[PDB]
Write a protein that binds this ligand. Sequence first.
Ligand SMILES: O=C1Nc2ccc(Cl)cc2[C@@](C#CC2CC2)(C(F)(F)F)O1
Lengths: 520, 403
Amino acid sequence: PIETVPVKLKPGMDGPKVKQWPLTEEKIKALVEICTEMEKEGKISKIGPENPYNTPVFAITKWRKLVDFRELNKRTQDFWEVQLGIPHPAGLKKKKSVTVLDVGDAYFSVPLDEDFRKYTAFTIPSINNETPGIRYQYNVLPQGWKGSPAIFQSSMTKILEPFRKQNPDIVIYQYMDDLYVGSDLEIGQHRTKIEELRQHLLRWGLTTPDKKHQKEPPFLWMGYELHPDKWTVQPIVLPEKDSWTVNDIQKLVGKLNWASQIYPGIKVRQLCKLLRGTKALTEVIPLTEEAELELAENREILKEPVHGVYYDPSKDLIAEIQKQGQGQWTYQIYQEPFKNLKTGKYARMRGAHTNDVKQLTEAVQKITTESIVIWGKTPKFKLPIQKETWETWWTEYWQATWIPEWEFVNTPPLVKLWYQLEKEPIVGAETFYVDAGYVTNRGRQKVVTLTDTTNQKTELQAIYLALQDSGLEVNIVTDSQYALGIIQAQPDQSESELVNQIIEQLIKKEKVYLAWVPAH
Amino acid sequence: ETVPVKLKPGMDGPKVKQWPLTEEKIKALVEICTEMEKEGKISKIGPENPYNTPVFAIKKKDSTKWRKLVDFRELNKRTQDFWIPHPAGLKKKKSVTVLDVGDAYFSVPLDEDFRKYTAFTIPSINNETPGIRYQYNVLPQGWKGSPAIFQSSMTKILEPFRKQNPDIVIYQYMDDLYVGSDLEIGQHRTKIEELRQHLLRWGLTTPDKKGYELHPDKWTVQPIVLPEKDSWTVNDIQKLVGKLNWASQIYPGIKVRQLCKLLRGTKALTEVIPLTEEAELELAENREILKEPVHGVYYDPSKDLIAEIQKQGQGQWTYQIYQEPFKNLKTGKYARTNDVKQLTEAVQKITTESIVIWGKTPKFKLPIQKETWETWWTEYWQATWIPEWEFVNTPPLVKLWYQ
Ligand SMILES: O=C1Nc2ccc(Cl)cc2[C@@](C#CC2CC2)(C(F)(F)F)O1
C-alpha cells in the first residue's frame, strides 16, 4: 500500500547477532503457528541461514509472540520524535459530535525498508535437535522496533491527507493507535463520514471498530474527561484518614496540583509545609490545624464538578490574574465572561528576593508562553496593577521587559511598591557610614559582633542596624555592592529574614537614600 | 552540479527545538513554504530525518510581505569551514547601502547528501497535528555554506560593475550585500538602484534593507564621562571617586588621592565641599585622560567579538564591543515603543556595525529573561542573520558608570 521509509543503522554499527534463548516445545509449537500465519499474511518471510543476524524471541490456551528488539534498537538510527507534546483540552474547538477510532493492525499494515528487513531476522528452534531452526525476517513494521511508532504516524497522516482536504469540516487528531474525529455535523451525517473514513482506511488495510464497538463520550483522556462541548479533569477523590504518611501527603499535593488547571481555589501551601524535615516516605505527619482546614476546603471545592469550555476562535482570549498570598498567583483564561477555557496558579519565585511587580510580570510571561502554545495567540490581560506603578518599576529596573495589551483591574489586593529609594541624598537627614557596625555624621555609633554569620549576611545586618537607629529620613553609605544591589532592586519579600526585617524598615521610612562607595 | 559540502569531522546534524510560534506566523510560513516546495526549493521529508533547525517569520519594514527566517546558527557552527578578506576600506566609506541578495542562492542546488541537515519544521498550534517538515534542495538563505558556495558566481556576476566604477566598495556577508562609496547622497541611491538592476539581470529582484544607508564615516566612540558639577557635595565626590576608581582599571593614569582627601572623616552627604587647587587639577587630568579610548587595543580576528548592552532607562542604552575585558574595541548608545523593541533594534544595529567594521557578528549579552526575548524578538527583528546571544543580569554599578 504505502511507500517505504528508507532506514539505516547507526553509522559504523552492524546488525544484531544475539543468542536465541532455549524454548520449551510448547513454546516452539505456539510460535510456529503464530509465525506461519504471519508468513501467510506476509508480515514476515522465511530466509536462508545466509543471514548472520538474529534477534531473540519468546512466548508470553493463551499464546503470543514477543520479539525483543532492544538490541537492534540500540543500533537503529534515531527518528524524528514521534509527536512530542500533546494538545491541552482548552485548545480544542467545540464539536457537535466526536468519534474516537482505534486503529488495529496499525504497525502490521506498513511495509519495512527492504534494505533493512534483513536486520530484523529472528529464529524459532526446531523441536528435533539434530535439525536446525527456522529463520525469518519482518516485511512490515515490527511491534517493539524503534522506528515503528514514527514510521506509522507518518504514513497515517499521509493517508489522512487526502480525505482531509475533501472534508475541511472534519477535524482529526492522531494519537498513538487512536484517531479522534470530530465535527459539527448532524448526528446522522457524522456517523456517515466516520464510516467513510473507516473505509478510506480499510482501503489501505487499516481496520477500526464499527459504530457499536466504539468508545462513546466523555472520553477519559490523558488525565481528563472529554465531552464534545466541554471538558474537565479525571474525577479526583481526596482520601479520608487520620494517619497520613509522607508519601501520602506527596501524592495528595500532586493530585491537588493537577487540579489547579481547572479548579480555582485549590491550595497546598499548608499541606506542603508538612514535608519539612521528613525522614522517610513512610513517616507519619499529623495534619496541623491549617492543613486540615486546607484539605477540607479543597475537598469542598473538588466536591462540586467544574468544567472547562473549548476554544472559540471567533472570540478574544482574556487572562485575568490575582495574587492569593505571598508569592501565590492565580489566573484564569476565558473568552466569554467567566466561561473558563482554563485556569491556573503560579508560585515561581524567580530569584532570592523580588517584589509583586517583578513576580506579577513573570506570571504574564508564563501565561503568555502557554497561550501561544495552546491557542497560538496572546490574551488581553486584566491585571491588579496600575500602569503608573508598572512604569515606575519599568524605567528603574536595569533589565528590559515587555507586557502585551493589558488593562488595570481594580480587584484587591492591588499590586504596589511599598517603598522607593530617593534618587538623591536627603538634606538634613543624618548620615550612616556602615562597614559589623556603623558610624554617623552626628557622632553616633554601634559596633555589634554576631555569632554565626556569613560575610554577605554581616553587611545587611549593619545596614539593618542603621535603619533601626535612624529617624524617618536617613542616608546610608555602604561599600557592599551586594546589599546595595539587593535593596536597590526594591524587594518586598525575601527567603532571608534579615532582608524582610530591613524591608520592614524601608517601608516605614519617609525617605531612604542608599549609596555605595568602594571599600578601603 | 552540486558542490560536496560536509560537516566538521565527527559532528552530527542539528536537532534544535522549535520555539512555539503564533498562528499568525505559522500561516505565513505555510504560504511561504508551500510555494518554495512548489518551486522545488524545499521538499517534504520523512521520519528517517531526525534533524531540525528553528524557523521564524519576520516582516519587511515598509513592505507587506512576510519573510521566512531560518536559525541556521547551530548548523553553521557545525559546517565545514571553507579553507574575500574583510575590506578595511568599507568602514571608511561615506555611505553604505545594504542589500538582500538572498534570493541569489535559490538557484544553486545543495549537495544531496547534505540536504537532510537543513531540516526544519512548521509547528502546529496546540500539537493538534504533527507539524510540517521540510529540507532544502537549493542553497538555503542564512546557511554559512551558501555565500561560500555562491562566492564564485558572485565574483563573476559582480566583476563587471566592480571594475566599471571601482569607486565603490561592495561587500557580501551571508544574504546581505554592503555597498559603500563616497558619492553624494543622491548620486549614491542612484548607482545604488542601478546595481539593483544589474543583479536583476542575473538572479533576484533584490530589495535593500537596514532602505536607508549607514554612515560609518560618522560612527564615533562614547568616552567615559564625568559630572560637570557647579558645586560639589560629599555624595557627588563619592560617586566621582568611585567611578574614577573603576575607570582606573582601564586608565592607570587616573588619580583620586586628592579627591579622596576632600572626603575626610564622617561628613554629611549633602555637605557641599569646595574643591582644592590641588584636587581641581587632579580631576582635570583624569578628565583629560578619559577624553579618548585606552591605547593598545587591537582587534584579534582569532578571537570572538562580545557585545554587552545596558539599560540606562528612559529608552536609552549603552553598549560595548570587545574581545578582552576592559579592552573595548568600541562603545556607543541607542535611544528611543517598548523595552524589547529597543533592544532588538540595538542588537541588530550593533551587529550591522560589527559586520561593517570587522565583517563578523558579535556574541551578545542581553539584559533580559530568555522566555521574554524568545517571545517578542521576532516581532521587530528584520535582519537576515541572527547573532549568538546570552542572557545576563547586569549589576546596576556598571550601568552607573556609563553615559
Ligand atoms: O478540535 C477538537 N475538538 C474536540 C472537541 C471534543 C472532543 Cl471530545 C475532541 C475534540 C478534538 C480532539 C482531540 C484529541 C485530543 C483529544 C477532535 F479532533 F475533534 F476530535 O479536537
